From Swiss-Prot, chains A, B:
InterPro entries: NA-bd_OB-fold, Phage_M13_G5P_DNA-bd. GO terms for molecular function: single-stranded DNA binding. Gene3D superfamilies: Nucleic acid-binding proteins. The record marks H41 as: Involved in DNA binding, and in the dimer-dimer interactions of the protein-ssDNA complex. It comes from Enterobacteria phage M13 (Bacteriophage M13). This is DNA-Binding protein G5P. SUPFAM superfamilies: Nucleic acid-binding proteins. Belongs to the inovirus G5P protein family. Binds to DNA in a highly cooperative manner without pronounced sequence specificity. During synthesis of the single-stranded (progeny) viral DNA, prevents the conversion into the double-stranded replicative form. G5P is displaced by the capsid protein G8P during phage assembly on the inner bacterial membrane. Keywords: DNA replication, DNA-binding.
Length: 87, 87
């Protein structure tokens, strides 16, 4: 399980000039999180916040492969890891 | 959990000219697997086989973030998903 802890100062997203894929500049809500990812310590990594979605509240987390996909290279590849609280 | 089923015809790796990262051609053992990844159906994806490691035997599987890492872009990123049997 790709655990992670959204610090208390990382419970709110912010609107920053985002870019889908070099097509157009989108102002989406971005957030942060701390994924140990097996690194023993928490790693403050960024995260996307759906429009209207509540920033990853303060709590434990576990990435979600719902964002992972199979590329034509025959190898899984995250397209936008969907973070979720750890149960 | 990134589930997956290593078909019965995908329980053995093969030695194919591999390339670490554009540095040198390595002949490692590669294998295959079927990760539904939430796609309802199984997706035959490729996989690497450590030298001396037994190809992903025939059984259920779940990728492993032990291969995932945090890039300097502030976003998790698989470096070489370590597949494992699903328990």
């Amino acid at each position: 399980m790709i655990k992670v802890e959204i610090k208390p100062s990382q419970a709110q997203f912010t609107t920053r000039s985002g870019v889908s894929r070099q097509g157009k500049p989108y102002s989406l809500n971005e957030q942060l999180c701390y994924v140990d990812l097996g690194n023993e310590h928490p790693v403050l990594v960024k995260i996307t916040l759906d429009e209207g979605q509540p920033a990853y509240a303060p709590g434990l987390y576990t990435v979600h492969l719902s964002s992972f996909k199979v590329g034509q290279f025959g190898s899984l590849m995250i397209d936008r890891l969907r973070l979720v609280p750890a149960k």
